[PDB]
C-alpha cells in the first residue's frame, strides 16, 4: 500500500513515517466509513464543527 | 550540528512543497507546561 497510486489524502500524526515497519506494535484497529471530500481535513483532531 | 529546515523525506520525492504522513516539517515544539510533571518538565542538560 506504500506505493499504491490512487491514494490522495495521506496525512497522519502518530508514528515515524517511513520507519513504521521497524517499530513493532501490539494490536491494529481499522476504522472504515465514508465522508464528503470537502471536510476530509476536518477529520484531524484539534478543531471543531 | 545541523540547522537546515528543509522538508524531511526518506525516499518520498514529491514531498517538495507539501506535508503529509510521510513528510513533516523537521522541527517540533516543546510544551513545557507548568502542569507537566517531572517526566516532561524542562530539564537543563549540559553534557561536559
Short overview:
The structure is cut from a larger assembly and holds two copies of chain A. Chain A has 49 residues and is low in regular secondary structure.
What does this structure look like?
Helices cover 0% and strands 0% of the residues of chain A. By secondary structure, chain A is largely without helices or strands. The first copy, chain A, contains no helices and no strands. Chain A binds chain B through residues 10-13, 17-19, and chain B through 10-12, 19-24. Chain B: It comes from Severe acute respiratory syndrome coronavirus 2. Chain B: Residues 1-25 are annotated as: Disordered. Chain B: Disulfide bonds join 15-23.
Name some characteristics of this structure.
little secondary structure; viral protein; 2 chains; part of a larger assembly; Spike protein S1 (chain A); 49 residues
Assembly form of the protein: part of a larger assembly
What profile does the largest beta sheet of chain A have?
none
Task: Give the DSSP E fraction of chain A (strand runs of 2 or more residues).
Answer: under 5%
Radius of gyration of chain A: 13 Å
**What's the count of strands of chain A?**
0
Name the largest protein-protein interface in this structure: A-B, 7 and 9 residues
PDB class: viral protein
Keywords: SARS-CoV-2, omicron, RBD, viral protein
Entry title: SARS-CoV-2 Omicron spike in complex with 5817 Fab
Chains A, B: Spike glycoprotein
List the SSEs and their pairings:
This is part of a larger assembly, with two copies of chain A.
Chain A: no helix or strand
PDB class: viral protein
Keywords: SARS-CoV-2, omicron, RBD, Fab, viral protein
Entry title: SARS-CoV-2 Omicron spike in complex with 5817 Fab
